[PDB]
Design a protein around this nucleic acid. Structure first.
Ligand SMILES: [Mg+2]
Ligand SMILES: [Mg+2]
Ligand SMILES: [Mg+2]
Ligand SMILES: [Mg+2]
Ligand SMILES: [Mg+2]
Ligand SMILES: [Mg+2]
Ligand SMILES: [Mg+2]
Ligand SMILES: [Mg+2]
Ligand SMILES: [Mg+2]
Ligand SMILES: [Mg+2]
Ligand SMILES: [Mg+2]
Ligand SMILES: [Mg+2]
Ligand SMILES: [Mg+2]
Ligand SMILES: [Mg+2]
Ligand SMILES: [Mg+2]
Ligand SMILES: [Mg+2]
Ligand SMILES: [Mg+2]
Ligand SMILES: [Mg+2]
Ligand SMILES: [Mg+2]
Ligand SMILES: [Mg+2]
Ligand SMILES: [Mg+2]
Ligand SMILES: [Mg+2]
Ligand SMILES: [Mg+2]
Ligand SMILES: [Mg+2]
Ligand SMILES: [Mg+2]
Ligand SMILES: [Mg+2]
Ligand SMILES: [Mg+2]
Ligand SMILES: [Mg+2]
Ligand SMILES: [Mg+2]
Ligand SMILES: [Mg+2]
Ligand SMILES: [Mg+2]
Ligand SMILES: [Mg+2]
Ligand SMILES: [Zn+2]
Lengths: 105, 187, 159, 53
RNA sequence: CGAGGGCGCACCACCGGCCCGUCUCGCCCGCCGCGCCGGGGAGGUGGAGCACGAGCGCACGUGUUAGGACCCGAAAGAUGG
RNA sequence: CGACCUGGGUAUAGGGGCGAAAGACUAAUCGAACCAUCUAGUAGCUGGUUCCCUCCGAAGUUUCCCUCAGGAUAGCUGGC
RNA sequence: CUCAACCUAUUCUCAAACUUUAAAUGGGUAAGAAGCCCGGCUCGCUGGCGUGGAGCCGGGCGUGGAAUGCGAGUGCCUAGUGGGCCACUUUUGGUAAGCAGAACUGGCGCUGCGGGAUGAACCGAACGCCGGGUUAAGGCGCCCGAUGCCGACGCUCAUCA
RNA sequence: AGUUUGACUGGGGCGGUACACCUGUCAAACGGUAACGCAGGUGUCCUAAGGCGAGCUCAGGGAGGACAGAAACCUCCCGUGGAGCAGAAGGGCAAAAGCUCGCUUGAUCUUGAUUUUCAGUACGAAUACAGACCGUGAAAGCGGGGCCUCACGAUCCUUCUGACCUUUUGGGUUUUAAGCAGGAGGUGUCAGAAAAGUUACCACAGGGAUAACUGGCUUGUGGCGGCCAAGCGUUCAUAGCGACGUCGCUUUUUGAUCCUUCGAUGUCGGCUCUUCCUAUCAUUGUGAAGCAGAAUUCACCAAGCGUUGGAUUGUUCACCCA
RNA sequence: GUCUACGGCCAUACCACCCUGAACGCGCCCGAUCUCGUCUGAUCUCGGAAGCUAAGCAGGGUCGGGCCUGGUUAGUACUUGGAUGGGAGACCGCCUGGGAAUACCGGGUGCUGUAGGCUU
């Protein structure tokens, strides 16, 4: 799919439709001090081996793309997450399509 | 052969008190005669309530009895309850009531008598009105019991507001998955 | 083994009648539906919005709610050994007024008129419908003409 | 296996509890022994208060 | 006996009302702390709620469960000899 | 007449020993001895489950489950 | 002159995954008192309009508005079961099967009894202990209850009837 | 050293996925309805192929026009859709839902209700509203994704976003952490364990719920017959045969099934021995011939009697010698 | 008796060809300055009124096609329920009720609402 890099959509802080910058959300780095990670490290230390399941049975080939909208209002930089459907190829602000054009020879 | 079904032949109802209380059995003997030998339907209702179990004879508070006897046209009538009359400490003034009950709490009895009221047992009521004339036959709240909060549709079904059976109440006891949209679903 | 698709087995059920395709006639949008009237659920397939499920095609219900384009209908549905009153939102293209209620409401007004006239005039008239009684005794005239004799025809191989 | 409506019960009887069971058949005897010791102590401290300080 | 009429128990259906959470809208009030303070309203919606208590203790029955667990039954595993 | 047969004395002990090797032998037990204990181990599997009369009286189907010899669930049953 | 294709008007034969038409059996709803008809009141909804809609408050109407039958409503707790099988009919795979798989009703399972010699299911009929009467399905040479009727009319000879 | 090494399944394995879904049919004119039933499809794709508005008409054909032809573009006429609408199929659709333009982001922020599967649980998907903020159009309106039916995912954990929000334990400040609300990272065995083999050295609990051997149903296949008679038979359908078709029987073949047996019915062949069957090889008595005789072939009554010795091979079968 | 504007049902209204059309109307028609769109004032938009019913439109016609409605087909096909009916079967008959569809043969060829005109 191809979503433009800018869209005018509802901003919850402004309470109205505003222009937004559109980027692709990427998962942040793990904290190592999240409570679940702290519990995992304590559980794993010592003898006993692997104490939690390791999935290793992958079936999906795609992910739901998440767009991070940022309100371009200078005072309100409020962010939001929109999920769109699954797609194998994702393009941000790519070239648009034209109808009456000659396909490359 | 006859094309009939026999699964509803035997009607399930109390034909006698399951209690062995001989004082209850004596005034069951009294009202069994009254129901049979009069045409009063009051005696039939009183007799069938004498058979009834305790959960089917809930206590009647003083406030509820006062409220039902204060309705227009019920003055100088005998409030009859087949069960216990219970004191209510949420009422401040007790009017002059004439009551007939199976049991009356010690404090409810003292309050009624101080107000100038009268308390009758069911044999005194039979003498005072064998046909049950001039009476207000009252009942306690039948569904005012904790079991009825758990009865109904299952708690895990939509639009059901029935209490679940939990050993303890707190934020860790049956509040996550199936109770809020943030944990799976809510319904 | 059967799929659970919402429109499985509705190939003819939602198809338009022969030479009745095209634009939906506008009087179907001009019918007035109020709370409490009886409506048959058809389910035409030209309009894909507000379509009732295939189990409600041919069922009759009672309107309980009116919106801009649809109505809410309380319609009975039989599920195994119990019947339970479903409430469905159906756009008005897929419903029409049930004439069974119209016929009965007509008969009520006629009955109340007939009682009113009979009381003011001094008569008693049967108002209940009675089932078709046994035929009365009558005379059949031959009109001087003997009944025509009928005999079974001989067999022959037609073709 | 759960059956219809009920309470999720978690009995703590997975740990060989039958080998550590305290019965109380010596409770009436313990009350007698404590009572006798109380009386003996009061006799020992003759005019002093029987309870203590 | 009795057409009609009346007060209506319990309970059921429905409509209102009140309490806590959370939204939306909006205007007022309080004062030793004039505050990034405190209180209040209307309209939806979430609660195992209120709406003149019904529980507690004891006994019995049935059902479910943890225990050797209705009775008998493995191939095995472990500790020490 | 030999890498021969054999007594007695010694050494090696159980996931160990010993094997010119067959998973052989290790007290009639060996692809892990025997003894006691943990232990009445667990079993969705097989077998059994003790007096009389009266009344009512089924299911082998729905949905979910590493579910298919089992359960939960609805249904059908009885009792109050 | 002739044969093709093409077109036109006809003609033979078909369709579980074709169809104009279109049954039988079947599915839903209605057959009143919570109804009908009068007046009024409320609304922040709707709006040319005292307009619409809904709600509420009074009043008057009983020939109780098809047949037939039946006393209903409602709650709690709950066992067993969750291998099924058979028959008429419809029906899928298979050459077929006492095969495998569906639909409907009934049955067996859980069920004895009369008959089919015999038999889980067929036909009749379902059951407390008995006497008398009468039947069902089926029978009435003898086994073996009952034709030991002066039964009626035909058909049939088989050296595998 | 510990543990695991899915399920369904006309036994199991191999093969497939009938394991989560969608279309038509089965399906017996409501709905529902099975098999490793039939014909197929899905794990995507799309800033437009989403949302409005406007203007147009599509497939195909006929007739014409320089190059230009059977297909290049232009023109007229006919054209109920015979095209197109992303994809499988079905439905639907014509100043449409198709094509081309213009403007856009309703594919946004929210609370409930409902439908579908259904236990009337969830997820997914969908329907009708209500409250915001927008788009488009002159407006009525239409739009909170794709014309409809499919295109997907719990707890725990992680990660991001939001409240000048709550807690962070004697008080305060600040980092940090925990929380509340909403997205995402996924479990395809798709209501969601973290998982390779081998055993003939094997073990146990069971199973005739389930295979290997008999028996039973069936008889496709095997075997043996019949009907018709185009032909073969120097001629001549039928002495002897019998193509194209068609009707049967048999259970000495092999399948099909899984009813009995898994707290056991000893599983091939030979040897030995008895009996039975007839669809008769010989012998007895016969009929027919393309029966001169001899020999042979066909058929009838017929199972009384006989049907052998050996080489090779475990063989049954086979083949050869006599 | 008709028409116009807006319609309801959506062919008894459609399609092919022919004839007639008074009056209003509806059109065809004339032009591009403005408004507005085009490759093209053809369409659309605008400004008109010389001419014409040739066309559209209306009415009528056709042993017209279609469509609508009847008869026939036909108590046929199929079918609910029943039998210890028949038949080796395949299937068939009867009892009890329901009951079609072609071909073929007839008739018909828009009704109508609101508002506003014309018709001696
Ligand atoms: Mg019984
Ligand atoms: Mg309420
Ligand atoms: Mg229980
Ligand atoms: Mg035991
Ligand atoms: Mg182990
Ligand atoms: Mg070996
Ligand atoms: Mg043991
Ligand atoms: Mg078993
Ligand atoms: Mg079967
Ligand atoms: Mg059984
Ligand atoms: Mg039974
Ligand atoms: Mg029986
Ligand atoms: Mg018998
Ligand atoms: Mg027999
Ligand atoms: Mg008798
Ligand atoms: Mg006999
Ligand atoms: Mg005899
Ligand atoms: Mg014969
Ligand atoms: Mg059907
Ligand atoms: Mg159906
Ligand atoms: Mg358009
Ligand atoms: Mg909105
Ligand atoms: Mg849509
Ligand atoms: Mg699953
Ligand atoms: Mg010849
Ligand atoms: Mg078997
Ligand atoms: Mg079987
Ligand atoms: Mg043996
Ligand atoms: Mg033997
Ligand atoms: Mg012979
Ligand atoms: Mg014609
Ligand atoms: Mg018939
Ligand atoms: Zn903003």
């Amino acid at each position: 799919v191809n979503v433009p890099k800018t869209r005018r959509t509802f901003c919850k802080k402004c309470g109205k439709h505003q222009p937004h910058k559109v980027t692709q959300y990427k998962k942040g780095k793990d904290s190592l001090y999240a409570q679940g990670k702290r519990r995992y490290d304590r559980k794993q230390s010592g003898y006993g081996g692997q104490t939690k399941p390791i999935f290793r049975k992958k079936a999906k080939t795609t992910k739901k793309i998440v767009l991070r909208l940022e309100c371009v209002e200078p005072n309100c930089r409020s962010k939001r997450m929109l999920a769109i459907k699954r797609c194998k190829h994702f393009e941000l602000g790519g070239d648009k399509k034209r109808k009456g054009q000659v396909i490359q020879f | 052969g006859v094309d009939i079904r026999h699964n509803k032949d035997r009607k399930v109802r109390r034909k006698e008190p399951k209690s062995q209380d001989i004082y209850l059995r004596l005034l069951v003997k009294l009202y069994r005669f009254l129901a049979r030998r009069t045409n009063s339907t009051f005696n039939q209702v009183v007799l069938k309530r004498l058979f009834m179990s305790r959960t089917n004879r809930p206590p009647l508070s003083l406030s509820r009895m006062i409220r039902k006897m204060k309705l227009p046209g019920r003055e100088n009538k005998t409030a009859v309850v087949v069960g216990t009359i219970t004191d209510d400490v949420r009422v401040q003034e007790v009017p002059k009531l004439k009551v007939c009950a199976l049991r009356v709490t010690s404090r409810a009895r003292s309050r009624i008598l101080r107000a100038g009221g009268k308390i009758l047992t069911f044999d005194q009521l039979a003498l005072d009105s064998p046909k049950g004339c001039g009476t207000v036959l009252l009942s306690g709240p039948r569904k005012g019991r904790e079991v009825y909060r758990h009865f109904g549709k299952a708690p895990g079904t939509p639009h059901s507001h029935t209490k679940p059976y939990v050993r303890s109440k707190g934020r860790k006891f049956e509040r996550a998955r199936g109770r809020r949209a943030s944990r799976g679903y809510k319904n | 083994t059967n799929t659970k698709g919402k429109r499985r087995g509705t190939r003819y059920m939602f198809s338009r009648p022969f030479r009745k395709h095209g634009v939906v006639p506008l009087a179907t949008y001009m019918r007035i539906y109020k709370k409490g009237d009886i409506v048959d659920i058809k389910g035409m397939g030209t309009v894909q919005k507000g379509m009732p499920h295939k189990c409600y095609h041919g069922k009759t219900g009672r309107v309980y709610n009116v919106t801009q384009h649809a109505v809410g209908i309380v319609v009975n549905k039989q599920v195994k050994g119990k019947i339970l009153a479903k409430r469905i939102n159906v756009r008005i293209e897929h419903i029409k007024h049930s004439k069974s209620r119209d016929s009965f409401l007509k008969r009520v007004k006629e009955n109340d008129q007939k009682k009113k006239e009979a009381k003011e005039k001094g008569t008693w008239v049967q108002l209940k419908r009675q089932p078709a009684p046994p035929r009365e005794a009558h005379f059949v005239r031959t009109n001087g003409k003997e009944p025509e004799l009928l005999e079974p025809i001989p067999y022959e191989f037609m073709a | 296996a759960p059956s219809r409506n009920g309470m999720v019960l978690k009995p703590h009887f997975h740990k060989d509890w039958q080998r550590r069971v305290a019965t109380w058949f010596n409770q009436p005897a313990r009350k007698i022994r404590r009572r006798k010791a109380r009386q003996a102590k009061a006799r020992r401290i003759a005019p002093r208060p029987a309870s203590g300080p």
